[PDB]
Amino acid sequence: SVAILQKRDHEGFGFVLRGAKAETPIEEFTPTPAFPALQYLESVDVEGVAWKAGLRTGDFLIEVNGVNVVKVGHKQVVGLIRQGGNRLVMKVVSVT
C-alpha cells in the first residue's frame, strides 16, 4: 500500500522506524514475504499522522518518496525521510 503523509512543522509523523544499520547499501539480501525489507515500523502512535493514514505496527518500508529502500541502511532511510520535510510518501507491505 501507499500512504501520503502530510504533517505540520510542529509534529512528527507518529511512527518509530527500526532496522539494519549499514551506511552503504548491502547487498544481495533477498526480500521475502516473511522479511520484505530491512526497515519496518516498530510502532505507530494512535492519533498520529501515520496512524490516521492507516499505517500500522509491523509494516515494512518499501519506498520513500519514490526511492526503493528495501536494501538501504537505516541512517540513509532516515536521511531520505528527512529530505522530504513535512511530506512523506511511503510504500509499505504488511507482513501480517
Binding site: 512528527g12 522506524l17 544499520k21 537505516h74 532516515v78
Partner: peptide
C-alpha cells in the same frame, strides 16, 4: 539495528 522516532 537502529531505532528512530519520526
Amino acid at each position: 539495528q537502529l531505532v528512530t522516532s519520526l
